[PDB]
Amino acid sequence: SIMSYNGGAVMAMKGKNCVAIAADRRFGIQAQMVTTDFQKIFPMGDRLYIGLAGLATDVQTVAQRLKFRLNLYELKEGRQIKPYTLMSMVANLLYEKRFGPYYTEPVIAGLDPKTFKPFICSLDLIGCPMVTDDFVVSGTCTEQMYGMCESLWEPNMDPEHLFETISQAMLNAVDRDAVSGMGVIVHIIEKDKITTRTLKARMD
Amino acid sequence: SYDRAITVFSPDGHLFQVEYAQEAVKKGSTAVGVRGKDIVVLGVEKKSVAKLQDERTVRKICALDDNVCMAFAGLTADARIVINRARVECQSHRLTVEDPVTVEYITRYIASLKQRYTQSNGRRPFGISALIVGFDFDGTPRLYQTDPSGTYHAWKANAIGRGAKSVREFLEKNYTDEAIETDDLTIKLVIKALLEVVQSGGKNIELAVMRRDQPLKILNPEEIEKYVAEIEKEKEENEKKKQ
Amino acid sequence: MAERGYSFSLTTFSPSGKLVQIEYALAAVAGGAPSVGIKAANGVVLATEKKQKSILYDERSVHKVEPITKHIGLVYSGMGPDYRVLVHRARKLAQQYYLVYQEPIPTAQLVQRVASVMQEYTQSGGVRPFGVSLLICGWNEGRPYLFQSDPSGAYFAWKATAMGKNYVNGKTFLEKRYNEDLELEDAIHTAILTLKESFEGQMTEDNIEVGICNEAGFRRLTPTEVKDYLAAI
Amino acid sequence: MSRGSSAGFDRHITIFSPEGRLYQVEYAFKAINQGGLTSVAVRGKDCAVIVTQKKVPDKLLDSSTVTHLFKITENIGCVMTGMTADSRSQVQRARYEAANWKYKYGYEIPVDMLCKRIADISQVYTQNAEMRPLGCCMILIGIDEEQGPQVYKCDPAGYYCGFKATAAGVKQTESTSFLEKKVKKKFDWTFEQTVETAITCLSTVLSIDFKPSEIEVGVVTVENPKFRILTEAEIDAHLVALAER
Amino acid sequence: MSRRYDSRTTIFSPEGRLYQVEYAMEAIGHAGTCLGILANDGVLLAAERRNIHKLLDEVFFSEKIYKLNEDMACSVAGITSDANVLTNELRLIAQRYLLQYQEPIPCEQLVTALCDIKQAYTQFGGKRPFGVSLLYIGWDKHYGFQLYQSDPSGNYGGWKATCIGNNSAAAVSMLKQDYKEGEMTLKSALALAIKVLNKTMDVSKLSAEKVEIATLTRENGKTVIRVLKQKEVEQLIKKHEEEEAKAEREK
Amino acid sequence: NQYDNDVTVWSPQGRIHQIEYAMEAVKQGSATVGLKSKTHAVLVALKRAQSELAAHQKKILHVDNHIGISIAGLTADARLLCNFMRQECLDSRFVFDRPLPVSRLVSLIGSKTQIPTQRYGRRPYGVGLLIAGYDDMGPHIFQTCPSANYFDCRAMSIGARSQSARTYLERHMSEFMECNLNELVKHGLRALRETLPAEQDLTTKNVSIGIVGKDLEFTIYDDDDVSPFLEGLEERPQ
Amino acid sequence: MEYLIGIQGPDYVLVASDRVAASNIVQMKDDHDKMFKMSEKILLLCVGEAGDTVQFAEYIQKNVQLYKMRNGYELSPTAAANFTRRNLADYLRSRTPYHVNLLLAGYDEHEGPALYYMDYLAALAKAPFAAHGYGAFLTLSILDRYYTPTISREKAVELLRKCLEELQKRFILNLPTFSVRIIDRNGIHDLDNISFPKQ
Amino acid sequence: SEYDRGVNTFSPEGRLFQVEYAIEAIKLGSTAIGIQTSEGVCLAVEKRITSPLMEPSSIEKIVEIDAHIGCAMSGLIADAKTLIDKARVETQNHWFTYNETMTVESVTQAVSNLALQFGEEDADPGAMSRPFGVALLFGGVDEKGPQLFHMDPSGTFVQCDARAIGSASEGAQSSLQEVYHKSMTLKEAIKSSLIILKQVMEEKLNATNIELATVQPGQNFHMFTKEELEEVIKDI
């Protein structure tokens, strides 16, 4: 109930040498839409992104506190954080509030620095990490996203096939959820470039 | 957790730490405040001009609120601490009371903070003296002075810092209702008092002006130079016509 | 009884601008047993002398070359119980880093945290600075690291260095013997020779302690391995 | 700096001298000798023995309460040397540390671990200025299942070490040289030989023939790991056997 | 007890002075030279490398120059481990401001927060002061490119060109004579820095391994902070040597 | 010297000098006498005036209906101790609904005033007290000192020139027990008068009298209530 | 329930709020200002639980003015909105939570006009127009229907009047008068109250 | 030199060194005189202005503690500020709890309880590190009539018929002793106070050099305006 207060949906998907992360764009309070360009996907590096679903206040708070800790980390160590290290840092941040939890479920998509091996993971609200090799979902329409991703995902997709797969999964999943949608943003992370797209979507 | 008594009485009845903080004040650059009819003027000597220093960063005159400003002599970092505390107090006073502070209120607060630092464990007194000027809601110009011991008084005109004894003698010989009849005359009085101790004839002078209902104004070097030229012209006129 | 310590600093600035207590801690370090670190191309060797004052001492009971993690090793010159304090603190800091990030702490990070602790003891109330210098070795990202941390809390990265008695001569010997591209076996030989330069009497496999760090991790050499190396010399 | 140089308060608080020494720790080492007694510990192949000098000048003193031998746990014994009240505070701390180790980790503390814990606690006194170090030295004996008998010594400096044999107190230098001679000519030390070696070391450095009431003996063996203090009958039997040879 | 062993670090002297602060300033005067120069298109730090020894491992990023956030950097002179404490505090302050306002901290505010920490050590607590002077270079949307200098007393000031550490007074005389306000470019500023370091480091000749140079500039609305490579410093020193030789040939 | 500044420093002779200096603080104060009969306890305090135009300083304080005190030494320390004693008496009446026995109160005072004699940066209380009380054990006179030692007394005098009063009390101690209230007060007044200069005499201005008894709650007589006790005093024998 | 509305134009922000203070069934006040001036170009509009609103708004106002005094320049509207959100979010899980709904209207000399929506949970959103209250349900669709990004300030005032007339027609609550302010490069200007005086 | 002894060290004569030094500090203060009559209490203080540019109205050496209690101070006035604030708080606390005016003696007792609450060890942070360097004259009217109390940094407070504090308190006290009789009127008290202040003041005594205030039964604390001051001083 609390996690569904603002709605929202985030999804990450693994390609052959690339990752994709997509989110709905609606910010609303219960049934009422407020805006249609709420940011849920934040960059934590050149090739590392975190998407946050759940309470919008906790989305913003956790993104800002993670940016705090990540900036300190990357100043103390003269290197960029690895996706596994970012996942551990996020889990520690969430578990610090074990009994007063932040109401967000993060999704992490990235490429290994200096290795460029795709990494995706999801965490629950108290920071239990789950690394997969195909896809992770988070938000208020995880059942629909699971149907779409389990049906459509294939191993070793090139970035264009990956974009089409994650786009169709997100679009058809949020078309079937009342409090998500109003546009979809997709990031495709390759080793040499990042592609950001907004999909044509239903606005009802 | 450091709980040493730093300020203690000496066998002659003296608080040596307070006297040493006053000696620290006496080594600061001269500051002069003159209270006029419609204007309050603050002026600070610059002991040296480095010619490479950003001026905006080393100003000795600062605004505590819209109606209150202060100059200081002594230790710059202690002054920064005191100024920040006074600014917080002014905002909190605007909150809990729906009016701005009187000059005397913020002066009382600053003086009591300094006194607390003369009588509490584990800390030394502040090594600054402050000249606080402003206008009350009644529009009355007010000028106050605080010292490291925690005592504060109201002045028509005053000087603190090094060479303040000669500047105070000059102000006693010169401050008059006719000498503050207009704003320009008050500013010229401040600049003349500063010229009694500063070298290079007005390049080492920072001057600030507060008028009723108006925010603090800082004179740029052009205005200071124009006023100095006016003062020297008046000197020449008096010398030649009377002699 | 009163458990309150002193709250004022015992290390203060002298009129010439020096902190004499830190220089005296350095004198304590300079009176310590010689230690040598050599960073080879594929690992680091830390060699120290432990010449007991009597045959009644059990050599195996106490160790001067210590593991901090599976990939980080420590040795010291100076005062042994201070060293034990710092070893315990370094192990705890490495564990806390692993608990937060779930990867082993990089050597430079652990050196920074240990040096921070040493600085704290140069400034806090009622304490003297530590009377030890640490040589820290590690393997990270397919790369060897060798650091020295001083009682002031300053740390340096070294290719080869010596601490303790006759460390100036040891440094001269190292800089006229060390070269890049050196392998770990040759670095072990050079470290043992550097110890031998300042050693008094016969050097045996029990008189010295040797630890090595490579990709496999950090480990202390058993006295049999040290005896083999000594025979090779 | 110069030999025996001093600057500031380095002779009064635990801060470094210009040579890097801690004079208060050295003074605590002298406080150990202030007690006037000597103890010896010897490790055998299957046993460890502590023998301490027992002095009761006056008959008004209940002798059963004049002991420097203590049991820390069932299986760990100790002999204390130096200032008596400091020694008893260290004994109480050691008993507490052992009990807590058993409670937290579920097995008996090893002797080396207990010695290291006490040594850490005393290093703290060497580094903090508001308190003096204890003027006492602790020798612990025990049986580790993996490594056999254990003799460990910790001193006011916070330094600790394992020993084949060791001594503490006034004549500990002579005792150490005697034990060096005995351990160089290494022969298999049975329980009897270990006890006789300890007793003869004490008697030869103190230059007196002993009596069962003049010394105190505690032992741990592999057969009986429990720490036990020999009664005057057992000590007199050992003394007779030593005197006839 | 406490009273007889207390050093009384935070008390006034009979002349109105704070002795521990003055002795920390003496420590600063001992340390390696750091120089800061502000130009119209950027700002630079040039620091003498005091850790010079053939057996020293090559430094990771820089010996004396620390990035503080995306837009600011600093150089330190004095006690090194105290400088580590202070640089960690600065990074924490900058990130706290970023968390609070979601904007980068203006340079003067960061300097002011650190100087408040320093002053607090000068006034209460009975601890010894930090023996560090700092140079700060930064960019913000309020005042553009900025150079600041802070002392162990907690005093700070902004500068067009300044120097701390060894021979800082002669370097300041050089800067007063040679700096041209409102016309400096990063190329001319780098040349001035090389000449100043040549004079200040009188005993040891300028080689690229004895100095560290970092420049802060703006590109495409981003702040770029870069430590110059060894070859770049070698080229700058070669250019300075050519300038000196030709100026001698003219004379 | 090096041994006379801190209360935590033992002198090589086995003494603590700060405690003795606090004793001197008590000895500087004006004299006061306390004595008891079988049924009454009387404190008589010679008050001192700073100037001719000042009131004489209060010396006798109420503690409880059955307990009063007279003070010598630092007055502010005496007020601290008096507040503590009043709080103890109120605690006893609150918890047990009985008046606190006098000797238990004196033990509490000793415990409270011993603590600052052993802790660094503390000082002894610089006040000596005469405590007059009545309880189930009858009347009691107690004397408390800066050293935290206390004495149960037949009679006592503390303050300046108190040795003459103590000599008089030595002389008439045998008489005190069977005296009636007026005679007991007169004995106390003569002892107090023995500490006076030759020119000065006991007057209703410089004499304060506190009385406690079996049926009499503790009562203080200051200026005009003192005159019935002063009437009938023979001139000083000399 | 109290009504807030903001409409952001190309170079201005127009804000309006109801002027009613109510307790139980009685309008206690009919000229109640729900706008708070943080700076020369920032307005904070706050509604919500009684007591909470003024306490939180004056705390923010004190901190923004203190920032100006300390630094010599003002906070930008985005920085102020984020400072407000951070403080509200910190209070949300503390012992003194504030139940306040906020609009932050501001003008920045470089970023132009800005309008921010904040619910009591302290989620911060940037919107071209926004509204708070039960009356938002009746006027957000009108704003959706007629708003364009290029809307002039007179057309903005007319659109606001349409929204308030809809509130008169359909809203059960009596909200007869509204305070109206506009922020632009020249600061904050008070427009005439939009009123519907009952005969 | 000054840190050899702690702030709570007794001298061999049984005195606290710091309290004695504060007593010495009070001899450097300006002279204040209180006189208690049956018709009221009068207080008079020398302002001791150092410069013509200083505003004498900003010197407040006589303050109102309550409508029925006033206070004259000597010594270090900045120290007296906190004691006076405490006195005001205590009077208002007593009014809040008991719905009556605190007596002068109990207010003086409450202020005197603070005199020796200083120390280095066994104290909360920020606790007083030294004694106060002030002497206070409390003049009030309570149910017992008009009363005048003297408080000194040792924490001793005494009722007084007439008293002088400050730099010239000895000669002024001797003058008070000859001038003062029990049936003195308040007008005579004011005149004698001004006469003695004129005698001991280094400067000439006018309506701006002095503060004078009275408390009377039925009239609140009243600080004499300068016109009233000139009315009294015109014939001295």
Reduce the DSSP state of residue A176 to 3 states and report it: coil
Q: Between vectors from CA F129 to CA F123 and to CA F130, what angle results, nearest 5°?
A: 165
Q: Which residues contact E87 (CB under 8 A, 6 or more apart)?
A: E66, E68, E74, E76
Distance separating alpha carbons of residues C96 and H80, to the nearest angstrom = 54
Q: Which of residues 84-103 of B touch G (CB under 8 A)?
A: 84, 87-88, 90-92, 94-95
- Write the CB contacts of D2 (distance below 8 Å, at least 6 apart in sequence): D18, D19
Whole-angstrom CA distances from B52 to E134, E158, E163, E180, E187 are 17, 9, 11, 10, 19
The residue with tokens 């320093």 is E118
Q: Of the candidates A166, A196, A195, which has an alpha carbon nearest to the alpha carbon of residue A39?
A: A196
Q: Are D130 and C20 in contact (CB < 8 Å)?
A: no
Question: Hey, of E3, E7, E10, which one would you mutate to test binding to chain H, going by the most H CBs within 10 A of its CB?
Answer: E3
* Closest approach of C89 to chain B, Cα-based (Å): 25
Q: Strand order of the sheet with strand E42-48?
A: E161-164, E34-39, E42-48, E211-219, E222-227
Q: Is E51 on the interface with A (CB under 8 A)?
A: no
Check H21 against B11: CB less than 8 A apart: yes
**Disruptive mutation site among B9, B17, B105, B116 for chain H (greatest number of H CBs within 10 Å):** B9
Say which residues have a Cβ less than 8 Å from residue H116's Cβ, sequence separation at least 6: F74, F76, F77, F80, H16, H19, H131, H154, H155
d(CA E43, CA E41): 7
End-to-end CA distance of chain C: 58
Burial (CB < 10 A; 0-12, 13-18, 19+), residue H216, is: middle
Which helix (H) or strand (E) is D191 found in, with range? helix D191-206
Residue whose C-alpha is closest to residue C158's, from C130, C186, C191: C191
Nearest C-alpha of chain G: how many angstroms from E99? 8
Residue C124, both tokens: 């806090």
**What angle (nearest 5°) sits at the alpha carbon of residue C38, between those of residues C33 and C40?**
160
What is the spatial distance between Cα B214 and Cα B207, in angstroms, rounded to a whole number? 16
User: Are C158 and E29 within 8 A, CB to CB?
Assistant: no
Q: Which two tokens stand for residue G25?
A: 């069934």
Pick the CATH number of C13-232 from 3.60.20.10, 3.30.1180.20, 3.90.1150.10, 3.40.1280.10: 3.60.20.10
Rounded-to-integer distance, Cα G17 and Cα G46, Å: 9
The string of DSSP codes covering A111-150 is E-TTT--EEEEEE-TT--EEEESSEEEEETTHHHHHHHHH
Nearest residue, CB atoms, A88 vs list C101, C106, C108? C101
* Side-chain-facing half-sphere of B227: CA atoms under 13 Å: 23
Q: N- to C-terminal Cα distance for chain B?
A: 69
Give dist(CA A158, CA A195) in Å, integer: 14
Q: How far apart are the first and last CA of chain A?
A: 22
* Residue labelled with tokens 């009636």: F180
Are E101 and G82 within 8 A, CB to CB? yes
Selection from A99, A115, A109 nearest residue A135 by Cα: A109
Nearest to H58 by CA among B40, B102, B118: B102
CA distance linking residue D217 with residue D230, whole number of Å: 6
- For chain H, say whether F71 makes contact (Cβ under 8 Å): no
* The two structure tokens encoding residue E137: 């270079």
Cα of F5 to nearest chain E Cα, Å:
11
Radius of gyration of the CA atoms of chain G, in A: 16
Amino acid G150 reads T
CATH number of H10-234: 3.60.20.10
Q: Which of E1, E3, E4, E5 to mutate to test the interface with D (most CBs of D within 10 A)?
A: E5
Residues 6+ apart with CB under 8 A from C122: C11, C19, C21, C22, C129, C151, C152, C153, E81
Rounded Cα gap, residues B216 and B211, in angstroms = 7
Report d(CA F139, CA F215) in Å as an integer. Answer: 12
Phi and psi at residue C150, in whole multiples of 5°? -95, 165
Find the residue in H nearest to F126 (Cα): H14
Q: How many domains are contained in chain G?
A: 1
Non-local (6+) Cβ contacts of D62 within 8 A are: none
Q: Which two tokens stand for residue F205?
A: 């201005």
C-alpha to C-alpha distance for B75 and E10, rounded to whole angstroms: 14
- Distance between CA atoms of residues D233 and H228, nearest Å: 107
Closest-approach residue (CA) in chain G for A33: G140
> CA–CA separation, F75 vs H109, rounded Å?
11
- Cα torsion E217, E218, E219, E225: sign: positive
The residue assigned the tokens 């809040």 is H96
Nearest residue in D to E5, CA atom: D9
- Cβ-contact G89, G122 below 8 angstroms: yes
* Integer CA distances (angstroms), A89 to A81, A139, C100, D16, in order: 10, 21, 6, 42
Kindly state whether H218 is in contact with chain B, defined as any CB-CB distance less than 8 angstroms. no
Q: Spell out the SS3 assignment of E182-241.
A: CCCCHHHHHHHHHHHHHHHCCCCCCCCCCEEEEEEEEECCEEEEEECCHHHHHHHHHHHH
Q: How far is C24 from chain D (nearest CA, A)?
A: 5
> Per the structure block, which two tokens stand in for F194?
């023995």
Interchain CB contact of B5 with H (< 8 Å): yes
- Give the separation between CA E213 and CA A163, rounded to whole angstroms: 45
Domain of E151, CATH number, reads: 3.60.20.10
Which sequence spans correspond to the domains of chain H? 10-234
Question: Which of C7, C10, C12 is the best mutation test for B, with the most CBs of B within 10 A?
Answer: C7
Which of C66, D79, B78 is closest to E119 using CA atoms? B78
Q: Chain centroid to CA B117: how far?
A: 21
Chain G, 4 to 63: residues with Cβ < 8 Å from chain A are none
B60 touches B86 (CB < 8 A): no
Find out whether F177 and F38 touch, Cβ atoms under 8 Å.
yes
Structure tokens at A107: 């999704």
Contact residues on chain D for C60, CB-CB shorter than 8 A: 162
Q: How far is CA C147 from CA C69, C106, C108, E79, in A?
A: 15, 12, 8, 19
For the domain B9-242, what is the CATH superfamily, name and number? Aminohydrolase, N-terminal nucleophile (Ntn) domain (3.60.20.10)
E residues 1..40 contacting H (CB < 8 A)? 3, 6, 8
Locate all alpha helices (DSSP H) within F101-231, ordered by sequence: 102-114, 162-176, 181-193, 227-230
Report the distance separating Cα E179 and Cα E156, nearest Å: 21
Return the axis-axis angle of helices A83-95 and A56-76, rounded to nearest 10°: 120
SS3 C211: strand
Nearest-angstrom CA–CA distance, E165 and E133: 8
What is G61-116 written as a DSSP string? HHHHHHHHHHHSSPPPHHHHHHHHHHHHHHHHTSSS---EEEEEEEEETTTEEEEE
Alpha-carbon torsion, ordered D194, D198, D204, D208, to 10 deg: -120
Q: Judging by beta carbons within 10 Å of its beta carbon (0-12, 13-18, 19+), is residue B211 exposed, middle or buried? A: middle
CA of G118 vs chain A CAs: smallest distance (Å): 10
Contact: chain D with chain E (3+ CB pairs below 8 Å): yes
* Beta-carbon separation of C159 and E55 below 8 A: yes
Closest CA to F8 of C93, D213, H122: H122
Which residues on chain E are in Cβ contact (under 8 Å) with B51? 176
Structural domain for G161, as ranges: 1-199
> Is A152 within 8 Å of A121 (Cβ atoms)?
no
Q: Helices (DSSP H) in A17-158: which residue ranges?
A: 56-76, 83-95, 142-152
Phi, psi dihedrals of residue D161, rounded to the nearest 5°: -160, 155
Alpha-carbon span H140 to E147, nearest angstrom:
63
Q: Choosing among C61, C64, C206, which should be mutated to test the D contact, i.e. which has the most D CBs within 10 A?
A: C61
Q: How far, in Å, CA of H220 to CA of G146, rounded?
A: 70
Query: How distant is the Cα of A61 from the closest Cα of chain E, in angstroms?
Result: 9
Report CB contact under 8 Å: E85, C39: no
Residues of B in contact with E127 (CB under 8 A): 2
Residue type, E77: A
Q: CB A35 to CB G137 under 8 A? A: no
Secondary structure element (H or E) that encloses residue E137, with its range: strand E132-140
- Dist. CA B164–CA C70, nearest whole Å: 69
Q: Buried b / exposed e across H95-110, counting CB within 10 Å, b at 16+?
A: eeeeeebbbbbebbbb
The answer to whether B4 touches H120, Cβ cutoff 8 Å, is yes
| Look-up of token digits 């005679």 | F183
Query: Which is it for the CA torsion F159, F164, F170, F173, positive or negative?
Result: negative
The rounded distance, in Å, linking the Cα atoms of C165 and C32 is 6
Place of tokens 């002594």: B74
Residue A150, Cβ density class (10 Å: 0-12 exposed, 13-18 middle, ≥19 buried): exposed
Bridge partners, residue H141, by sequence: H146
Residue H10 DSSP symbol: B
From the list B87, B92, B94, the residue facing G70 with the nearest CB is B87
Closest CA to C219 of C35, C24, C63: C63
8 A C-beta contact, residue B157 and residue B31: no
Method: cryo-EM
Burial per residue of F80-115, b for 16 or more beta-carbon CB atoms within 10 angstroms, e otherwise: bbbebbeebbeebeeeeeebbbbbebbebbbebbee
Query: For residue C45, which of C219, C232, C213, C197 has the smallest C-alpha distance?
Result: C213
CA distances to C185, C204, C230, G143, H127 from C224, rounded to whole Å, are 15, 10, 10, 86, 66
Report which of A68, E128, B6, C225 is spatially closest to residue H130, judged by C-alpha positions.
B6
CB of B69 closer than 8 Å to CB of B63:
yes
Contact criterion met (CB < 8 Å) for D161 and C128:
no
Q: Which of H128, H129, H136, H143 is nearest to H110 (CA)?
A: H136
Residue F162 Rama label (left phi>0; alpha psi -120 to 50; beta): alpha
Q: Is F234 exposed, middle or buried (0-12, 13-18, 19+ CB in 10 A)?
A: exposed
| Residue found by looking up tokens 């007008």 in the block | H187
> Reduced to 3 states, what is the DSSP secondary structure of residue A23?
strand
Measured on CA atoms in the order C82, C83, C84, C88, is the torsion positive or negative? positive
Please state, in angstroms and rounded to a whole number, the distance separating the CA atoms of residues C23 and C26.
Answer: 5
In this complex, does chain H touch chain A, defined as having at least 3 beta-carbon pairs under 8 Å apart? Answer: no
* 3-state SS track over chain B: CCCCCCCCECCCCCEHHHHHHHHHHHCCCCEEEEECCCEEEEEEECCCCCCCECHHHHCCEEECCCCEEEEEEECHHHHHHHHHHHHHHHHHHHHHCCCCCCHHHHHHHHHHHHHHHHCECCECCCCEEEEEEEECCCCCEEEEEECCCCCEEEECEEEECCCHHHHHHHHHHHCCCHHHCCHHHHHHHHHHHHHCCCCCCCCCEEEEEEECCCCCEECCHHHHHHHHHHHHHHHHHHHHHHC
- C-alpha G57/C-alpha A18 separation (Å) is 47
Contacts of A92 in chain C (CB under 8 A): 99-101
Pick the residue from chain G with its C-alpha nearest to B91. Answer: G62
Resolution of this PDB entry, in A?
2.2
Tally of CB atoms within 10 A around E99: 17
Q: Which of A77, A84, A92 sits opposite C106 (nearest CB)?
A: A77
Q: H92 φ, ψ to 5°?
A: -70, -35
Ranges of H-type helices in chain F: 17-28, 75-96, 102-114, 162-176, 181-193, 227-230
Window 191-230 of B: residues touching C by CB (8 A cutoff) are none
For residue C196, which of C211, C207, C185 has the smallest C-alpha distance? C207
Q: Which two tokens stand for residue A12?
A: 């990450």
Check CB contact of A77 with chain C, cutoff 8 Å.
yes
Instruction: Please count the residues of chain E.
Output: 251
- Please, do chains A and D touch (3+ CB pairs < 8 Å)? no
Cβ neighbors of G121 (< 8 A, separation 6 or more) are: A5, A55, A56, A57, G92
Quick check: E247 contacting A, CB < 8 Å? Answer: no
Question: Alpha carbon of B180 to those of B37, B173, G162: distances in Å?
Answer: 7, 14, 59
Tokens representing E198 are 């040549």
Give the mutation candidate from G38, G68, G78, G82 for the E interface (greatest E CB count, under 10 A). Answer: G82
